[PDB]
Amino acid sequence: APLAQPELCAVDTAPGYVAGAHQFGLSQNSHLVLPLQQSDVRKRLQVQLSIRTFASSGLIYYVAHQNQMDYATLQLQEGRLHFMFDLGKGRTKVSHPALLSDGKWHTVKTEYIKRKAFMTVDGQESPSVTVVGKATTLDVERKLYLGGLPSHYRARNIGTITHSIPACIGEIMVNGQQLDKDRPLSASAVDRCYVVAQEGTFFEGSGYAALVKEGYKVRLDLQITLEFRTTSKNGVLLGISSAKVDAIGLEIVDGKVLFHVNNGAGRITATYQPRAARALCDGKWHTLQAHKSKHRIVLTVDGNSVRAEHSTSADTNDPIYVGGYPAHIKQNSLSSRASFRGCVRNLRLSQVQSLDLSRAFDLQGVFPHSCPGPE
Ligand SMILES: [Cl-]
Ligand SMILES: [Mg+2]
Numbered sequence: 467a468p469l470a471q472p473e474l475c476a477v478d479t480a481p482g483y484v485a486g487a488h489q490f491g492l493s494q495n496s497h498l499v500l501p502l503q504q505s506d507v508r509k510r511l512q513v514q515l516s517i518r519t520f521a522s523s524g525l526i527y528y529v530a531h532q533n534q535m536d537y538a539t540l541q542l543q544e545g546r547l548h549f550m551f552d553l554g555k556g557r558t559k560v561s562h563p564a565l566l567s568d569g570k571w572h573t574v575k576t577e578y579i580k581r582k583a584f585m586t587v588d589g590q591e592s593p594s595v596t597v598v599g600k601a602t603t604l605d606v607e608r609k610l611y612l613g614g615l616p617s618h619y620r621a622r623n624i625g626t627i628t629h630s631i632p633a634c635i636g637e638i639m640v641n642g643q644q645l646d647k648d649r650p651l652s653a654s655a656v657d658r659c660y661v662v663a664q665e666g667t668f669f670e671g672s673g674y675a676a677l678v679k680e681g682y683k684v685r686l687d688l689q690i691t692l693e694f695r696t697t698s699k700n701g702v703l704l705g706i707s708s709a710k711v712d713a714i715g716l717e718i719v720d721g722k723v724l725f726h727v728n729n730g731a732g733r734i735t736a737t738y739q740p741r742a743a744r745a746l747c748d749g750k751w752h753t754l755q756a757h758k759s760k761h762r763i764v765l766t767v768d769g770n771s772v773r774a775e776h777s778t779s780a781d782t783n784d785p786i787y788v789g790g791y792p793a794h795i796k797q798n799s800l801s802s803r804a805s806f807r808g809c810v811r812n813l814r815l816s817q818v819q820s821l822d823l824s825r826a827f828d829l830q831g832v833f834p835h836s837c838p839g840p841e
């Protein structure tokens with residue numbers, strides 16, 4: 467029974483979904499395996515597709531011989547496109563300057579024809595490159611992998627960018643023919659695209675994402691930074707806990723942000739309370755910094771800091787739970803059990819390390835890299 471009428475939070479407007487489009491990158495192996503029947507790519511491979519993304523890296527498409535001696539692939543790296551193939555006796559590579567990670571739709575074309583190869587993005591064609599090697603044919607299996615690769619597949623000689631691209635892909639054509647993406651040979655972890663999206667990972671409020679199955683050790687010093695947006699007053703953000711006492715936690719309870727830490731001598735808590743109760747559930751992005759050092763704990767929200775200052779090591783050796791946690795998992799430094807609802811972006815631990823939610827080993831009600839609504 468509150469003394470004043472409750473302060474309502476902002477409201478989220480569902481954008482709906484794009485018809486005939488697929489969102490990849492939800493897991494490191496999200497993909498579609500599409501049949502190639504009428505295409506003869508031996509002397510010519512022209513692929514045209516539309517893409518929308520905020521990501522910096524990922525595999526967009528791949529085709530290869532059973533022995534992998536012949537192949538062709540399109541990958542994104544540092545926000546830019548790279549097209550390469552090997553006809554059996556040498557690799558040819560083409561790059562394009564266009565920056566694609568702006569969240570807007572782009573048309574892309576990759577072309578290998580005769581003894582030349584080139585790329586086109588939004589109509590801007592790159593200079594041609596001469597096919598390398600003596601071989602004259604691209605000999606590959608009658609199958610194209612779109613948006614990523616199967617978990618059991620081991621792609622050779624295409625570098626380390628073999629994870630699924632966090633992006634929405636529309637229709638795709640090969641040598642003038644539109645492929646029926648609705649009739650894939652097989653697939654894994656694919657979903658729909660929001661009509662309008664913004665950079666981030668959506669948490670529907672029902673589950674969580676668990677990372678680092680081998681265990682993470684907080685120890686003495688650790689810096690956690692992230693950005694979040696939400697229209698709810700309660701929600702767990704992050705927790706790393708031993709099955710005993712040592713643990714750390716970050717959560718939103720009744721409009722306030724709490725950073726708990728326990729080095730084996732009791733819970734230490736830094737609390738941030740905004741001027742307005744509904745300030746943080748306004749649907750806009752907020753920055754969050756939580757630094758743990760020897761005998762110091764500092765929580766900073768939107769530039770506002772709050773700290774608290776005899777064991778000093780948080781001896782954890784467990785997974786990192788994001789956005790919530792299941793009942794059978796102990797979280798000694800979290801008072802709440804409520805799953806977060808909203809989006810989180812730029813999650814990093816510091817010597818910096820950013821956490822990629824698409825790598826979660828256990829995921830429930832969370833959609834990495836896919837966040838609805840405009841920014
Ligand atoms: Cl100790
Ligand atoms: Mg060949």
Ligand SMILES: [Mg+2]
Binds near residue numbers: 781
């Ligand atoms: Mg200890």
